[PDB]
């Protein structure tokens with residue numbers, strides 16, 4: 117890792133978006149710190165996702181060589197192309213974040229995943245004719261944005277919190293209060309320190325009974341203000357977000373080219389992670405070059421960090437953060453391996 | 454206010470002398486503070502546990518906007534009167550505190566933090582000149598006591614620290630079955646730790662007045678302290694270059710004098726004066742030269758240096774994530790119980 121200071125993951129033909137996601141998660145320093153601190157001494161090295169994740173993260177930080185993922189893929193049972201083909205990227209993220217979240221429960225680092233990744237939203241129904249609502253709170257770890265017909269992220273959030281009028285034919289059934297003229301919608305209460313946006317390029321096609329990739333132009337900013345999509349905003353902490361990672365795909369199928377762009381320290385110093393090969397690149401290469409347009413190349417997932425949280429999220433990782441139990445277990449594995 | 458400097462003070466609660474100064478010093482040893490928050494004080498008594506009590510002080514220092522109290526802390530290690538403080542040099546309290554938490558860290562993810570941060574290695578020797586005999590005693594140290602009497606600066610104290618003493622004449626060395634021998638006695642530094650705690654020995658027994666008195670002679674200490682020359686063997690990759698982190702100061706002639714501490718917590722030459730509740734930004738000159746000394750009785754008695762190669766690890770940033778929710782909930786719980794004791798104690802009395 118001589119040129120950038122960052123090491124690659126081995127090209128695995130069978131794993132598609134995984135390398136891109138693992139880098140993105142590794143560079144979420146506070147998650148990596150939590151993960152290192154997880155107590156995993158009495159686990160099976162084949163089968164535990166936490167332990168496999170510790171290994172990958174450890175090796176990504178310390179190895180001079182491209183890091184392998186086979187024990188990781190083994191641990192969560194996605195050991196073939198087909199597993200990746202049948203899951204959106206956020207579902208893999210959930211497989212990973214969920215395993216480590218619930219292993220952190222009752223530990224010194226409990227509550228770290230939700231503190232980093234969990235925002236809150238309400239799905240509401242509001243009858244305009246009589247005062248009956250149906251406010252429904254709900255946690256989220258990621259947001260799936262519509263890009264079809266949308267110029268940019270801003271327009272996707274507008275659409276995301278757009279008002280559907282429930283009138284005439286499709287009035288809201290209030291059950292005991294009958295049919296009601298209402299408006300349906302979603303409001304954000306909070307946005308987390310680390311904001312995972314998936315761009316919904318893969319859409320079902322009635323004409324061919326299949327998912328197809330939309331390669332249309334869709335713009336995302338380096339700096340993303342989000343106060344206007346919140347219910348109540350905070351004066352001391354505006355929802356101003358900083359672009360941290362761009363997960364990119366070239367082509368129209370799972371055999372295409374998966375890379376990830378990252379500015380790991382949050383300083384606009386961008387790197388391209390193309391499996392084992394990691395190289396410095398321009399902001400333009402990481403950002404505008406991946407807006408897409410009409411086999412070719414665009415973003416399908418973005419990671420933003422809340423600007424007020426950058427120093428927490430991207431806290432430097434120190435030897436303190438890796439317990440010797442962990443250093444030694446991983447040494448002992450390599451001892452046999 | 455914490456609003457001026459970003460740092461909060463410790464309450465002035467009776468005469469605990471040098472404690473507040475030492476507490477702030479240890480708090481801004483970030484790596485230590487992180488380890489402390491990590492100690493499994495799950496079912497510790499709050500009145501008895503020094504580890505828990507320290508976690509409370511460090512936590513309140515990191516989050517309180519008001520001055521932080523130390524009464525449960527003083528109670529936990531049993532120093533509740535002026536005499537407890539008068540019968541201990543500053544390093545003795547530090548040892549009590551570091552040893553408690555060092556022991557509480559045993560079998561935890563943060564075991565060996567205390568020695569990693571504070572433990573250096575030395576050898577004291579006696580070599581016979583005329584005969585082939587040598588006693589060597591390897592020892593760990595967590596602090597160093599420097600002689601200032603007739604020393605201009607730290608460099609001179611260190612020279613004197615490793616100076617060879619000729620055992621000849623009347624005070625010959627007893628070499629066992631070699632009889633008395635001309636010997637020479639000395640101390641060698643093998644290693645210098647990442648955090649270097651230097652006490653300046655201004656408090657010395659005075660025969661004529663049969664008491665310890667404070668010596669207020671001028672004694673100079675650098676911002677940047679090179680120590681390679683005092684190592685038995687140097688390291689080409691990691692020279693013993695030190696950075697002044699803190700200057701613990703005293704004003705007056707006895708334990709009822711004034712204790713403050715100067716600290717540039719980030720190790721960036723940006724200094725604040727910590728005077729109990731009142732923390733204020735100050736000049737580098739107020740911190741360093743103005744505490745050289747030389748009735749002027751305001752001067753440094755203890756210095757904290759951090760090795761330059763370790764600075765960013767010792768002073769690594771502390772965030773909310775470095776405090777387990779379990780600890781935060783536990784310290785909230787103690788606050789409620791103490792709030793209730795305020796009411797309970799007042800009902801008995803009124």
Ligand SMILES: C[C@H](CC(=O)N1CCC(O)(Cn2cnc(NCCN3CCCC3)cc2=O)CC1)c1ccccc1
Pocket residue numbers: 132133203204205206260314315316317318319320327328329330365368369370415416417
């Ligand atoms: C052909 C590849 C397949 C792929 O690796 N991935 C599938 C799509 C991907 O998950 C991003 N994304 C995530 N959730 C979406 N939700 C709506 C549609 N899905 C629901 C069921 C399956 C499709 C839609 C979407 O687009 C990224 C990984 C691709 C498609 C589109 C963009 C890039 C690459």
Ligand SMILES: C[C@H](CC(=O)N1CCC(O)(Cn2cnc(NCCN3CCCC3)cc2=O)CC1)c1ccccc1
Pocket residue numbers: 470471541542543544598652653654655656657658665666667668703705706707708710753754
């Ligand atoms: C009057 C105060 C008392 C005080 O709070 N302290 C006593 C001395 C202090 O502990 C620093 N220091 C530490 N180990 C020393 N060792 C030799 C003398 N001691 C041996 C047993 C007791 C005296 C000598 C010394 O000087 C700092 C706190 C004072 C005296 C001198 C400088 C500053 C303040």
